[PDB]
Amino acid sequence: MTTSQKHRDFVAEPMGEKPVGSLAGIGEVLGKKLEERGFDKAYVVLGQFLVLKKDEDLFREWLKDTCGANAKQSRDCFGCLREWCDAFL
Amino acid sequence: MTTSQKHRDFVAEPMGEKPVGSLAGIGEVLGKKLEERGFDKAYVVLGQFLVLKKDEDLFREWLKDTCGANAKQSRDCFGCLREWCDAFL
């Protein structure tokens, strides 16, 4: 139901060292799982997106299989990360 | 002996989809080895640098162990990729 202001805020300015849970689609509980998986910061997760050549099917299985995110949560991270790259990459 | 103009050209404008061998420190022969390793484009190699949290010792072993680059060639890619991130990340 309408994206949060975080989506426009993230693709409106550099990401710097913001925490992983700052990425749109990742909640406080999910941010903790990615952190246990070695992604304590967003740019480390951005790297995984870059390693998958922006492949949406591979990206979705990675997040869901890695933490259990739902199909709705994965759609927000794909378009959210894909849009940041369009402005910064 | 003095860096090539490619170093200043790469950190002077976005990287887009330039080929891997376009990264400073990677020669035409080495670009072919990375390509056989699955890195047909520079942004895929940029992702590995991001996944290593910019760790220089881990990055150097990755390139040398992955293709056989010399210690001099690895120094150019670290500072070259590190400088691009400073301007675009």
UniProtKB/Swiss-Prot annotation, chains A, B:
Modified residues (N-acetylmethionine): 1
Subcellular location: Nucleus; Chromosome; Nucleus envelope; Cytoplasm
Modification (Microbial infection) Phosphothreonine, positions: 2-3
Assigned keywords, A-Z: Acetylation, Chromosome, Cytoplasm, Disease variant, DNA-binding, Host-virus interaction, Nucleus, Osteoporosis, Phosphoprotein
Impact upon substituting residue 37 to E: Reduces LEMD3/MAN1 binding
Transmembrane segments: none
Main location (coarse class): nucleus
GO CC terms of this entry: chromatin; condensed chromosome; cytoplasm; cytosol; nuclear envelope; nucleoplasm; nucleus
Entry comment on modification after translation: Ser-4 is the major site of phosphorylation as compared to Thr-2 and Thr-3. Phosphorylation on Thr-2; Thr-3 and Ser-4 disrupts its ability to bind DNA and reduces its ability to bind LEM domain-containing proteins. Non phosphorylated BAF seems to enhance binding between EMD and LMNA. Dephosphorylated by protein phosphatase 2A (PP2A) following interaction with ANKLE2/LEM4 during mitotic exit, leading to mitotic nuclear envelope reassembly. (Microbial infection) Phosphorylated by poxvirus B1 kinase (VPK1) on serine and threonine residues, leading to BANF1 relocalization to the cytoplasm, loss of dimerization and impaired DNA binding activity.
GO biological process terms, semicolon-separated: chromatin organization; chromosome organization; DNA integration; mitotic nuclear membrane reassembly; negative regulation of cGAS/STING signaling pathway; negative regulation of innate immune response; negative regulation of protein ADP-ribosylation; negative regulation of type I interferon production
Domain HhH: 20-35
Effect of mutating residue 4 to D: 75% cytoplasmic localization
Effect of residue 4 to A: Delayed phosphorylation with a 10-fold decrease in the initial phosphorylation rate. 71% loss of binding to lamin A
Effect of residue 51 to E: Complete loss of EMD, and histone H1/H3 binding. Reduces dsDNA and LEMD3/MAN1 binding
Tissue spec. comment: Widely expressed. Expressed in colon, brain, heart, kidney, liver, lung, ovary, pancreas, placenta, prostate, skeletal muscle, small intestine, spleen and testis. Not detected in thymus and peripheral blood leukocytes.
Record-level Gene Ontology MF annotations: DNA binding; double-stranded DNA binding; identical protein binding; protein homodimerization activity
Outcome after substituting residue 60 to E: No effect on histone H1/H3 binding
Record keyword DNA-binding present: yes
UniProt-reported outcome of changing residue 53 to E: Complete loss of EMD binding. Reduces LEMD3/MAN1 binding. Enhances histone H1/H3 binding
InterPro entries from the UniProt entry: BAF, BAF_prot, BAF_sf
Annotated positions of the Phosphoserine modification: 4
Domain of life: Eukaryota
Mutagenesis or variant effect for residue 33 to E: No effect on histone H1/H3 binding
Subunit structure: Homodimer. Heterodimerizes with BANF2. Interacts with ANKLE2/LEM4, leading to decreased phosphorylation by VRK1 and promoting dephosphorylation by protein phosphatase 2A (PP2A). Binds non-specifically to double-stranded DNA, and is found as a hexamer or dodecamer upon DNA binding. Binds to LEM domain-containing nuclear proteins such as LEMD3/MAN1, TMPO/LAP2 and EMD (emerin). Interacts with ANKLE1 (via LEM domain); the interaction may favor BANF1 dimerization. Interacts with CRX and LMNA (lamin-A). Binds linker histone H1.1 and core histones H3. Interacts with LEMD2 (via LEM domain). (Microbial infection) Interacts with HIV-1 pre-integration complex in cytoplasm by binding to viral matrix protein and Gag polyprotein.
Biological role: Non-specific DNA-binding protein that plays key roles in mitotic nuclear reassembly, chromatin organization, DNA damage response, gene expression and intrinsic immunity against foreign DNA. Contains two non-specific double-stranded DNA (dsDNA)-binding sites which promote DNA cross-bridging. Plays a key role in nuclear membrane reformation at the end of mitosis by driving formation of a single nucleus in a spindle-independent manner.
The protein's name: Barrier-to-autointegration factor
Lineage: Eukaryota, Metazoa, Chordata, Craniata, Vertebrata
